[PDB]
Design a protein around this ligand. Structure first.
Ligand SMILES: *[C@@H]1O[C@H](CO)[C@@H](O[C@@H]2O[C@H](CO)[C@@H](O)[C@H](O)[C@H]2NC(C)=O)[C@H](O)[C@H]1NC(C)=O
Ligand SMILES: N[C@@H](Cc1cc(-c2ccc(Cl)cc2Cl)cc(CP(=O)(O)O)c1O)C(=O)O
Ligand SMILES: O=C(Nc1ccccc1)N[C@H]1C[C@H](C(=O)O)Nc2cc(Cl)cc(Cl)c21
Ligand SMILES: *[C@@H]1O[C@H](CO)[C@@H](O)[C@H](O)[C@H]1NC(C)=O
Lengths: 101, 238, 82, 142, 286, 101
C-alpha cells in the first residue's frame, strides 16, 4: 500500500490518497526486507518524471528534479525503480550492482 | 468431360455435337489453362524454404529438464571441470546427472562435434560464445538471443580491500560508456562480422515423402469407392 | 534442339516395321504427325498404331515428352529474371 | 593471459620494443627468483587499461602471474591473481576476472564492463516444406 | 592510386546431374506400386454390380499420352478414376514446380565485395587468396593491427612474382589476388577474361621526386598542373592504360546443355533396344 | 513484454545503447555493501531468474518465420467472372443460332 500523487486524487491537483502498489520490483523490495532486516513505507510521489538536470528560472541552475530530488533533498533514502546508470547521476548518488541489463 | 478438361486430357470422351455448346466448353478450357498455370506457379513459389527456423528456446524449459520426453532426446553438454559445472550443479542437478554422457575435451572439439550433428545444443560461458559465434568461417551456427541468460554477472576489475581510490576508476569507466567507446573497442576486437546476413534460402531437393499427405488423400477416395461398392447389395435387396 | 529432331526420325522408322510384324495405315506420314503432337501438346485426332508393341514405343516417347516440356518451362522461368 | 582479451607474443625482431603494444608487462618467471623477460602484452583489457589511465592521472607496470590460473581457495588461502592482490604484492587485478560473492567479499570491485553468464548454442537447422504444401496455393474460396 | 582484388570471371555452367535429381530415388518406386494398385482396383470394381484395358487407362492418364480407350462404366469406378486423374496432375505439377525452384536458386556464388567479405575476413582452405611475398602489401598487412588472421592465411601461399600470380589465377590454383590498381585494370582490359573488383581502400598518389633543394621543383609542379588542366594527361591515359576496352554488362543465367540432361534420350534409346527384344517374344507367343 | 503480450507486433534490431538498471542511495548510507551482497546472492541462486520468468517473459507468443502469400478469393476473381459472362453470352447465342438455322 503506497500513497499517491495529486492526479491520482482527481479532484484537486494537490491532495493525495493511498493506492495498491504492486509489481515485481516490489517483490525484490520484499525479498531485501526479509534478508536485510528492516521495515519500510513506500510512497509513490513525484511530478511524474525521473528528473534529470534541468534549468531554473535563472537562479542557480542545479536542481535534480523529480526522483533525484526526493533522494538528494532528504525526502527519501532509497530508490527502487527502473533507474538507469549514467555517470552524471553517478556524481551525486551511489549505485548498487546491476541487476538487469 | 469438364473434369478431363480442367486437370489434364485423360481419355476418349464424347463431344457435345451442338453448334453452341462447343463455345461453352471452349471458354471452360480457357479457364482451365489459366487455372493450371496459376497453380503451378504459386506452388513453385511455396517450395522455397527459408533457411532458419532456428529453434528458439528458453532456459528453464521443459525442452531441457525433460530430455527423454521428446523424440530422440537432446545431446547437449559442457566442459566438466570448469565453473559453469558448479554453477548448475547447485540449482537443479537432475539435469546434471543426465548430461554426463556428453563431456567435451575442450572448446574447438565442442564446435566441431556441434557442426556434425553429434550435438544439438551447447551450454557454456556467455562471452566466450558471443566471441566464437562471430568468427568461424561458415557461421551456420548462432547463439541464442542475449536476453535470456541464466546467471548474469560481469567482467570487471579489482582493487585493494580498502578504498585506495575506487570511485575514480568507477567514474572513469562510466564516462567511457557514456561517450561511446566500448562499442568501438568491441567492434575492433570482440564482435567480428558475420552477425548479419540473417538467413539464406535453399532448395532442399524434395525427396522426403512429404507428399505422404497427397498419397493419403488418394487412399481416402479408394475407401469411398468401396463404400459405394456397397450399392451392389442395395440392388440385390431391391 | 537438334538431337530430338534426329531422335525423332530414328524412332519413327522403327514404327514403320515394328508395326509391320505383329498383326487406316500408320505409315511414316501419320507417324511423324503423331510424335509431333505428343512432344509439344495434344493437338488433333490422330491414328493410333494398333500394334501390341508399338504402343510401348509411343508410350516411352510420351515419357520423354513430359520430362522435356517440364524442363523447358522451368529453365525459361529461370531466364526471365532480369 | 587469455585468448581474446590479453595477448602475449614477443618483442620486436629489429629493436625489441613494441610498436603499438605499448606495455612490457614484465613476464616474470621463478625457476633466488628473478623477473626474466619483458614481452609485449596487447589485447582488449590492456587497451581499456591504457584508455582509463589516460584520464585518471597515474602510471603503471603490468606484472604477469605465476601461481595459479585465475584464483581459487585452498585451505583458506587464495591462489592466483586474487592471492596476488589480497596480500599487497600488487595493487590492481586486470583481465578476464569474473565477479562472484566470495571474491567481492575479500576484494572490492569496480562497475562491470562486460556482461556475461551462462548461455547456449544451436546449429541453425535447414527446415523443409510442410507435408500439406500441395493444398497451400489456393484458399478455400477457389 | 589504390588497391583492388583481381579474380577469375567464372563462366556460367548449370549444375544439374540427372533428370531424376528432383525426386528421391524412392518416390519412383512408389508411383509404380500406386498405378498398379489403381489398375487392379478398377478392374475389380467394374464387372461386380478388359485387364489390359484398365491397365493402359491408368498408364496413359498419368503419362498424358492419348493412347487408350477404356472408359469406366460403373458408378464405382468413375469416381476413383477421376480422383486418380487429379492425383496425376498434382504429381506432375509438383515435379515441375520443384525443378523451377531448383533452377532459379542456381545463380553462381556472388563475387567478393571489397575487403569486408566474410569469405575473406574469416579465412579457410576452401577459398585461397594471396599476394606477392615481401612486397608493399605484405608489409602493409604485417603492419596492420585490426586483422591479422588473414595475414596468417596469406602467409602460406605468396608467389614470388606477378606473372605466376596471373597464371595461377588463370589456372584456378588461386581464387583471388590483391594488388595495385593501375597494373590490374590494364591487365584485366588486356586479356578480357579476368575481372577486377572492390573499392580502392589503401590510397595514395604517384609523384616525381628530386633532392630536397633542387632549383627546379617549382617549375616542375607548375608544368604538371598545366598538363592536368589542358587535357594532356587525359590523352596519355586514353592512349596507354585504358585503351583496349573489354568492358561488358552483367551475365546471364546458365543454360542446361548437351550433357546436362543427357540421360533422358539415353533412356529412350534403351527403350528402343528393349522394344527390339519385345517384338520377338510377343510374336512367337501370340 | 508489450510484444509478447498482444502477439501481433514484433521487436527487432540489436541493443545498441547499453546500460544496467540499479538501486540507488545517498553517498554515505551504511547499507550499500549489504545491498550489493544480497543482490549478488540473488543473481547466483536463481531468484532473479524466477522473477524474470514470472513477470516479463511469461506470455510466450513466439513463433517461427512466415510463409509466402496465398492468392485468394478476390486475387484472381476475374476469371470466373469471365466464365459467367460466357454463359450469359451463350444465352444470347442460342436464340440467334436456332432462328438462323
Ligand atoms: C543444411 O544445408 C545443406 C542444404 O542444402 C546441406 O548440405 C550439404 O550437406 C552435406 C552433408 O551431408 C555436406 O557434405 C555438403 O557439403 C553440403 N552442401 C552441398 C552443396 O552438398 C546440409 O546437410 C543441411 N543440413 C542437414 C542436417 O542435412
Ligand atoms: N574467468 C573465470 C574463469 C573462467 C574462464 C573461462 C575462460 C576460458 C578461456 C577463455 Cl579464452 C575465456 C574464459 Cl572467460 C571459462 C570459464 C568457464 P569454465 O571454467 O567453467 O570452463 C571460467 O570459469 C573466472 O573469473 O573464474
Ligand atoms: O611492390 C612493389 N615492388 C616489389 C616487387 C616485387 C617484390 C617486392 C616488392 N612496389 C609497390 C610499391 C612501389 C613504391 O615505391 O611504393 N611502387 C609500386 C608501383 C606499382 Cl605500379 C605497383 C606496386 Cl605493388 C608498387
Ligand atoms: C576433468 O575431469 C575429468 C573427469 O573424469 C578428469 O578425468 C580430467 O583429468 C579433468 N581435467 C581435464 C583437463 O580434463
Amino acid at each position: 500500500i503506497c500513497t499517491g500523487p495529486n492526479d491520482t486524487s482527481p479532484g484537486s491537483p494537490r491532495h493525495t490518497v493511498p493506492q495498491c502498489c504492486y509489481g515485481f520490483c516490489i517483490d525484490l523490495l520484499i525479498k531485501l526486507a526479509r534478508t536485510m532486516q528492516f521495515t519500510y513505507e513506500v510512497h509513490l510521489v513525484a511530478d511524474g518524471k525521473f528528473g534529470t538536470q534541468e534549468r531554473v528560472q535563472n537562479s542557480n541552475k542545479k536542481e535534480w528534479n523529480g526522483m533525484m530530488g526526493e533522494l538528494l533533498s532528504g525526502q527519501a533514502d532509497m530508490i527502487v525503480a527502473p533507474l538507469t546508470i549514467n555517470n552524471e547521476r553517478a556524481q551525486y548518488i551511489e549505485f548498487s550492482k546491476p541487476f538487469k541489463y | 468431360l469438364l473434369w478431363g478438361l480442367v486437370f489434364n486430357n485423360s481419355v476418349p470422351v464424347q463431344n457435345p455435337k451442338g453448334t453452341t455448346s462447343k463455345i461453352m466448353v471452349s471458354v471452360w478450357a480457357f479457364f482451365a489453362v489459366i487455372f493450371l498455370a496459376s497453380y503451378t506457379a504459386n506452388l513453385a513459389a511455396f517450395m522455397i524454404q527459408e533457411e532458419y527456423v532456428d529453434q528458439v528456446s528458453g532456459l528453464s524449459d521443459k525442452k531441457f529438464q525433460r530430455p527423454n520426453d521428446f523424440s530422440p532426446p537432446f545431446r547437449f553438454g559442457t566442459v566438466p571441470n570448469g565453473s559453469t559445472e558448479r554453477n548448475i550443479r547447485n540449482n537443479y542437478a537432475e539435469m546434471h546427472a543426465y548430461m554426463g554422457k556428453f563431456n567435451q575435451r575442450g572448446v574447438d572439439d565442442a564446435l566441431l562435434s556441434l557442426k556434425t550433428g553429434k550435438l544439438d545444443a551447447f551450454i557454456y560461458d556467455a562471452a566466450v560464445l558471443n566471441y566464437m559465434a562471430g568468427r568461424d568461417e561458415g557461421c551456420k551456427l548462432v547463439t541464442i538471443g542475449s536476453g535470456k541468460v541464466f546467471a548474469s554477472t560481469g567482467y570487471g576489475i579489482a582493487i585493494q580491500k580498502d578504498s585506495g581510490w575506487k570511485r575514480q576508476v568507477d567514474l572513469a569507466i562510466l564516462q567511457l560508456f557514456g561517450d561511446g567507446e566500448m562499442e568501438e573497442l568491441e567492434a575492433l576486437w570482440l564482435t567480428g562480422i558475420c552477425h548479419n546476413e540473417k538467413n539464406e534460402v535453399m532448395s532442399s531437393q524434395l525427396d522426403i515423402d512429404n507428399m505422404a499427405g497427397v498419397f493419403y488423400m488418394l487412399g481416402a477416395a479408394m475407401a469411398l469407392s468401396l463404400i459405394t461398392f456397397i450399392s451392389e447389395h442395395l440392388f440385390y435387396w431391391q | 534442339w537438334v538431337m530430338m529432331f534426329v531422335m525423332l526420325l530414328i524412332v519413327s522408322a522403327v514404327a514403320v516395321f515394328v508395326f509391320e510384324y505383329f498383326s487406316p495405315s500408320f505409315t511414316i506420314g501419320k507417324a511423324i504427325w503423331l510424335l509431333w503432337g505428343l512432344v509439344f501438346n495434344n493437338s488433333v485426332p490422330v491414328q493410333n498404331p494398333k500394334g501390341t508393341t508399338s504402343k510401348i514405343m509411343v508410350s516411352v516417347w510420351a515419357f520423354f515428352a513430359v520430362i522435356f516440356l517440364a524442363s523447358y518451362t522451368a529453365n525459361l522461368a529461370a531466364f526471365m529474371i532480369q | 593471459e587469455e585468448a581474446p582479451f590479453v595477448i602475449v607474443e614477443s618483442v620486436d625482431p629489429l629493436s625489441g620494443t613494441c610498436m603499438r603494444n605499448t606495455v612490457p608487462c614484465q613476464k616474470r618467471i621463478i625457476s633466488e627468483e628473478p623477473g626474466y623477460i619483458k614481452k609485449c602484452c596487447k589485447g582488449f583489457c590492456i587497451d581499456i587499461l591504457k584508455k582509463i589511465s589516460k584520464s585518471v592521472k597515474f602510471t603503471y607496470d603490468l606484472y604477469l602471474v605465476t601461481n595459479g590460473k585465475h584464483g581459487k581457495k585452498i585451505n583458506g588461502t587464495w591462489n592466483g591473481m586474487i592471492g596476488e592482490v589480497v596480500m599487497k604484492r600488487a595493487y590492481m587485478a586486470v583481465g578476464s576476472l569474473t565477479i562472484n560473492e566470495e571474491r567481492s567479499e575479500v576484494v572490492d570491485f569496480s562497475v562491470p564492463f562486460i556482461e556475461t553468464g551462462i548461455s547456449v548454442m544451436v546449429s541453425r537447422s535447414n527446415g523443409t516444406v510442410s507435408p500439406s504444401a500441395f493444398l497451400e496455393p489456393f484458399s478455400a474460396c477457389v | 592510386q589504390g588497391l583492388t582484388i583481381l579474380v577469375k570471371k567464372e563462366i556460367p555452367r548449370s549444375t544439374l546431374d540427372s533428370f531424376m535429381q528432383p525426386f528421391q530415388s524412392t518416390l519412383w518406386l512408389l508411383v509404380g506400386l500406386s498405378v498398379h494398385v489403381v489398375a487392379v482396383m478398377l478392374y475389380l470394381l467394374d464387372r461386380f454390380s478388359t485387364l489390359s484395358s484398365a491397365m493402359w487407362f491408368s498408364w496413359g492418364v498419368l503419362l498424358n499420352s492419348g493412347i487408350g480407350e477404356g472408359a469406366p462404366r460403373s458408378f464405382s469406378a468413375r469416381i476413383l478414376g477421376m480422383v486418380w486423374a487429379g492425383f496425376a496432375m498434382i504429381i506432375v505439377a509438383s515435379y515441375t514446380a520443384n525443378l523451377a525452384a531448383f533452377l532459379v536458386l542456381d545463380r553462381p556464388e556472388e563475387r567478393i565485395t571489397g575487403i569486408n567479405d566474410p569469405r575473406l575476413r574469416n579465412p579457410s582452405d576452401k577459398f585461397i587468396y594471396a599476394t606477392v611475398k615481401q612486397s608493399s602489401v605484405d608489409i602493409y598487412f604485417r603492419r596492420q593491427v585490426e586483422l591479422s588472421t588473414m595475414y596468417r592465411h596469406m602467409e602460406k601461399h605468396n608467389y614470388e612474382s606477378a606473372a605466376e600470380a596471373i597464371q595461377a589465377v588463370r589456372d584456378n590454383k588461386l581464387h583471388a589476388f590483391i594488388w595495385d590498381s593501375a597494373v590490374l585494370e590494364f591487365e584485366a582490359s588486356q586479356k578480357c577474361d579476368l575481372v577486377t573488383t572492390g573499392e580502392l581502400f589503401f590510397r595514395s598518389g604517384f609523384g616525381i621526386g628530386m633532392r630536397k633543394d633542387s632549383p627546379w621543383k617549382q617549375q616542375v609542379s607548375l608544368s604538371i598542373l598545366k598538363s592536368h588542366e589542358n587535357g594532356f594527361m587525359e590523352d596519355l591515359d586514353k592512349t596507354w592504360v585504358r585503351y583496349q576496352e573489354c568492358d561488358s554488362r552483367s551475365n546471364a543465367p546458365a543454360t542446361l546443355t548437351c550433357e546436362n540432361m543427357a540421360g533422358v534420350f539415353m533412356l529412350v534409346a534403351g527403350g528402343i533396344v528393349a522394344g527390339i527384344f519385345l517384338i520377338f517374344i510377343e510374336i512367337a507367343y501370340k
